[PDB]
Amino acid sequence: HSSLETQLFCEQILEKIPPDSEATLVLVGRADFLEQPVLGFVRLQEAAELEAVELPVPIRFLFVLLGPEAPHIDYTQLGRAAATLMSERVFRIDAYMAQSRGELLHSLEGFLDCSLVLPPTDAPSEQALLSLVPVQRELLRRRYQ
Amino acid sequence: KVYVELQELVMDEKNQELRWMEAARWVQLEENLGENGAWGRPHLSHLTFWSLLELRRVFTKGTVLLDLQETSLAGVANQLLDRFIFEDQIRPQDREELLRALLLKHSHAGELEALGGVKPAVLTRSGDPSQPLLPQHSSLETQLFCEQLEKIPPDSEATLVLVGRADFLEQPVLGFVRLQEAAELEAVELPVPIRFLFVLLGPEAPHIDYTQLGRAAATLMSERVFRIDAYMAQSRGELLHSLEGFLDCSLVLPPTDAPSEQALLSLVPVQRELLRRRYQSSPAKPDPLQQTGQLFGGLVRDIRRRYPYYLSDITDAFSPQVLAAVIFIYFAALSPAITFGGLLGEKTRNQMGVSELLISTAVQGILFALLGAQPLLVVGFSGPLLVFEEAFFSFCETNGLEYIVGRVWIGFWLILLVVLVVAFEGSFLVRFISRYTQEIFSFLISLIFIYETFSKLIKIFQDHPLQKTYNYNVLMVPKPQGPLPNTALLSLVLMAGTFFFAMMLRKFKNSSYFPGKLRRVIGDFGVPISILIMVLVDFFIQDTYTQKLSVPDGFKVSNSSARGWVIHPLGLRSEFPIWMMFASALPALLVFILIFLESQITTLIVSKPERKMVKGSGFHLDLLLVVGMGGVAALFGMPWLSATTVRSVTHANALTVMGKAQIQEVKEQRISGLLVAVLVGLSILMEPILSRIPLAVLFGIFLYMGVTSLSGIQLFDRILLLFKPPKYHPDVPYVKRVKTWRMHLFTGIQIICLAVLWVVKSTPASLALPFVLILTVPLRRVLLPLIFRNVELQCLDADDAKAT
Amino acid sequence: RSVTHANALTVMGKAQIQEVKEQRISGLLVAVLVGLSILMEPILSRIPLAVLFGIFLYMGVTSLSGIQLFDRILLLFKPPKYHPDVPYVKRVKTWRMHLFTGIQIICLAVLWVVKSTPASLALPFVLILTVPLRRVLLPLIFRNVELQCLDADDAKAT
Amino acid sequence: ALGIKSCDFQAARNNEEHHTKALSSRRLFVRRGQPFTIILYFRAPVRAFLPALKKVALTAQTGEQPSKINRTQATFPISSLGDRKWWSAVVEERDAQSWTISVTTPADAVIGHYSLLLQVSGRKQLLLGQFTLLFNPWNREDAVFLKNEAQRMEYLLNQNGLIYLGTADCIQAESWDFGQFEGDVIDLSLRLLSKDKQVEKWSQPVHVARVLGALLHFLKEQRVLPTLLNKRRGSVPILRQWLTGRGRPVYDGQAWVLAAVACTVLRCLGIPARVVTTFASAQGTGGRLLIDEYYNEEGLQNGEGQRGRIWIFQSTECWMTRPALPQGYDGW
């Protein structure tokens, strides 16, 4: 399955990174000799620059997603979801303050609580789509409450 | 296309009795019922992640009763409970309680006010309802849309979604029923047969909101692909496959810190692609300057744009700011009219003078306020019109022709020219005049106004120079024939005081002093207050002489010997030549070009989108009215007018309401211009009031208008930035995206154009100014792209001040 | 004159006072030029008094920048929400501050009346009498924290 | 024309040279009396080196109220004539846009968190970064100087210690993780030291050691509860529970961990420390050289014991000079 993001945005940056920032690496791979998909979350004690990232930004968080070929599991989309979760500020603060997997799970549950699902419709209209703005604002207020 | 209704098992407050009350309905758009008895505004159905996850979880092991031969709610409930017991969804001991709950009274919005309201309810093991144990969560849809049947197709069927909470259930259970024949049940209070039934029952569990579960089920049923699949469903597997396909094309929007509408509109083609994936398998398919090309199309478009707002154009004037603007524009139009009438009477041997110009201004202003599309424009005489009148008078004197009859024929040709232009929609060419030419013209006109204001004071100083000795016996009637002491210095003092008071009151309008209402009242009346203060100051100085306003004694022609009120087109004293009647077209062409450029550029300036004009402007109607009124007034021996830039800009700024810096709204109404025209016409009848108003106060007012007309011009801003360090430049698109030296070169090119226009003004061939002004448009459209990039030109020259 | 001299030697930072050009050369040169004013009669004979009056008005309007009494007099004509973030506003009620400013205005009016009388040489005594007022009567009607916020030697929040 | 773009403290190299590499590779931990190297980056190229060098001065501040009389604030220029014994800065390598500056600290400097500030003439003070200054057992002029490198490693750098328990005739060595180079140990130790208000005496190892010992004994008295309860994971969790109050408390059966905690704090601050166990220790005598033991007719003790008892085992030893004492009392 070709990526929607590639087909849409790729068929046609380091300066905006803050100097006092840290990097997050998300690794996704497929291994047929694994029973079930496995998630690996690592927060380093001190942020360090690894050879994996070719940028002068230290790495603090590491995401590792490995598993076999299974239906309804796109590991590219899984890595995109993990990166979107990490890019969110509330989950980032919770992960910085995380002391166990329970806090990360609670942060993920709160992230999914304020997630907004748009079902497919026959006639897409921009007015009905702009009716979604205050719902998204309310979900944002719930996320940052 | 079906109607979907969602009902939730709730309890009333007046009797504490549990029953079914509708919560939301789907007519392909979702409407919610709040706690006031009235439905909320329609909106698209939006679902939470947990609602869809739980819907999939309960649908995977759900109970389906397809092509069920039942026509009553009791039969459907009995069959559903029997299949629940057969599939081990519920225990046999729960069947009686569930049958009691499903057969309760189904109330609607009509009887909500008849009761004491509705409260969330949970079915208990016994016959008495209990309260929920989990914390209550108010619905987002209710809080958002509820705090404020004809479209149903006749050949449609209904879907009922029932959600309830029962603490005596092990796990949530989904019940899907498709009737063999659609039937009308007592649960739905509408004459639409029910084909599908959704039943969602279960205990209180985390991440399970049964209202959101019912909303998700109703949204799933309202979708056309799932509806077709459910109609064609023969087992739970097909429904599960349809649900999986529905979730495949579902789009999840994660929370973000900064919500931007551009990044949200980047989602449109993703949603289109998901829609194409959804309908790839289903049998169904997814569901003022313009040239119209019609004769007099622009006039009708302007009429239909503006005349519906005629009622608002009277009610919007009920504010003291409108009265203050009336007082401002009365002087700001009367004083230039008096000066131009006096100059024209001196230059044309009083053939046209102050009285005729005032009467023409009053009549044209009244008609333009009553019938125009942009009443904020001020109609009055202008300097180029005076130059053309002097040139035409000189030509007629050289050729021995009656000049007033020549003006009559010029107006007759002007009427034909404007009718031809409006008929072919000739005002659509104004769209080629970008911000470049508009700002250059506005800056040049403001500079001319300030220069004339200072030159009048210089002339006053020259007439009464500072000398050691003066002759105390100098005749005063009609004007002083010799220098007088303390005249020029007092005029300078009065002008400086007027300007200082106007600027201080304008700052006080935006200041943080006094209560806000009184502060705005004082700031709006700042110009009348300054004028009154300076007039009173000059009034108590009896000994010193200052020049005052002069108006004619009555409504009469300036020179009775030359002409009367009606001028014969065939000639007054001598027979008018035949050749001049046809030769008057070229002077009429020049007059039409001048009036067209002035009025259209003024309308462009006053109707910019950044000025918050939310009523619309009509170029064709205003041009037609102005030129027609000029042609009609030419017959009566009255000067033709035009929409002057300074007066109209000042009128728009006086009616502009400033928000908490940022323009909020503009008091667009027809009362202000009508009252200004009426007061101009009645200026003769109020001679004692106007006779005590010095010209120095009016000069200070003119200076204030000139310095305030430069606020909205980006050319003035870049001229100011020419004397600033690059780090002090404001965060604007034409600075952060364009190099400083490129912007300075652009400003220098504009300054060169301004200098060329100023040189053209200071020559006897000053009537060629409109042509040189027009020549800037080929410059902008040709030479600037040769030396500037497209992005640079879009940033520097933007119609609505946007970053490309 | 001394306040104007201090302000003319004051260097303003990027609003905020940065440093003051404290030196003995300025006063010495001013005194020397005053002494030599007789010898430069042609230069001084062409200087009108109206320019000096405008300079005096500028000095008078610029001498009020550093006085908190002038700031509170200005705040008397402002809504409470427009008051700046200062210790004597965020910690003291608006009407208490207005009463304090009114007491100071009454003292100013008394001093002005004393000036406009033949017994104008008693002005230093009436000026001194404000110190017993501040040290006795103000604590009787204002709290210690209110007096510390309103009357602070280094503009500190108590 | 002399703007500052950034300032690289080079935490990794300096921490490896200052024997604080186990602390962090991101934060700058340096020891007094030893030079550390920083790199200063300019926004624009520097035209003339000497005038720009004359235009720049450096200021180091520590504490909430820095001052020169307290020796908590020092302003020094960037030149080769600076006192390398005292605060000084010299440019060792320079480019058009970067200066490699070697900064020295006095051997008797006040410890704690420092702020490094750069002043340009006719410009506001600019903060370059933060660093923590510690005692230097490697510096000969320092009061905590150790002659042997092996002794330095064992008594400061070794986080794997051994606490000896049991009896005199059967000594049971217990593995102990001091963890003085854990990330939060230095901050906790400095925050505990901040309770003392004599910041000018923080340059003296004797005063710091005495204050830390008194405060840690007070914390042991306040936090240790009367009687897995005896499962220990080192001195770091004990210090965290004593300071913050969150974690597994230590009970009276393991009250001997005070010596290990004190050794951890002293080693983290740069004072060489070791844990010493004395078997058959007479405690609670108040200097008296007599111990009274009471037994019944069955050779058993009826009561819980006297005030003065001979403990089965019982201390922290720190290495420093004693300037305030008569000569010859330097050492442990």
Ligand SMILES: CCCCCCCC(=O)OC[C@H](COP(=O)(O)O[C@@H]1[C@H](O)[C@H](O)[C@@H](OP(=O)(O)O)[C@H](OP(=O)(O)O)[C@H]1O)OC(=O)CCCCCCC
């Ligand atoms: C002669 C006047 C009356 C004398 C009687 C003296 C008695 C007297 O004048 O008090 C009444 C009133 C107090 O009422 P209050 O402070 O609530 O009035 C606020 C004031 O009008 C602000 O200007 C408003 O903000 P903005 O402008 O819209 O942004 C604000 O509205 P909002 O935005 O917050 O919702 C108003 O609430 O006075 C004043 O306004 C304070 C300045 C008094 C200055 C001294 C009076 C000149």
Ligand SMILES: CC(C)CCC[C@@H](C)[C@H]1CC[C@H]2[C@@H]3CC=C4C[C@@H](O)CC[C@]4(C)[C@H]3CC[C@]12C
């Ligand atoms: C542009 C508008 C005014 C129409 C064009 C003007 C021309 C075509 C028309 C309009 C009115 C006409 C005039 C009307 C009346 C007379 C009187 C008659 O004994 C001789 C011809 C004469 C003098 C006409 C000449 C042509 C004329 C001037």
Ligand SMILES: CC(C)CCC[C@@H](C)[C@H]1CC[C@H]2[C@@H]3CC=C4C[C@@H](O)CC[C@]4(C)[C@H]3CC[C@]12C
């Ligand atoms: C002529 C009077 C009115 C104004 C003079 C100011 C103009 C000419 C000056 C002031 C600031 C100057 C700019 C400052 C900095 C740079 C960056 C350099 O790499 C190229 C030149 C450039 C882009 C300069 C061009 C000229 C400039 C725009």
Ligand SMILES: CC(C)CCC[C@@H](C)[C@H]1CC[C@H]2[C@@H]3CC=C4C[C@@H](O)CC[C@]4(C)[C@H]3CC[C@]12C
């Ligand atoms: C006398 C002239 C110069 C200025 C008039 C402004 C003064 C008297 C007004 C303006 C704002 C007013 C205050 C506004 C709000 C309140 C809160 C109320 O619960 C008690 C009164 C109190 C505290 C008012 C006291 C009087 C007040 C300070």
Ligand SMILES: *[C@@H]1O[C@H](CO)[C@@H](O)[C@H](O)[C@H]1NC(C)=O
């Ligand atoms: C009126 O016109 C006549 C010529 O017809 C002229 O002589 C006279 O001066 C004019 N009146 C005035 C006031 O100029």
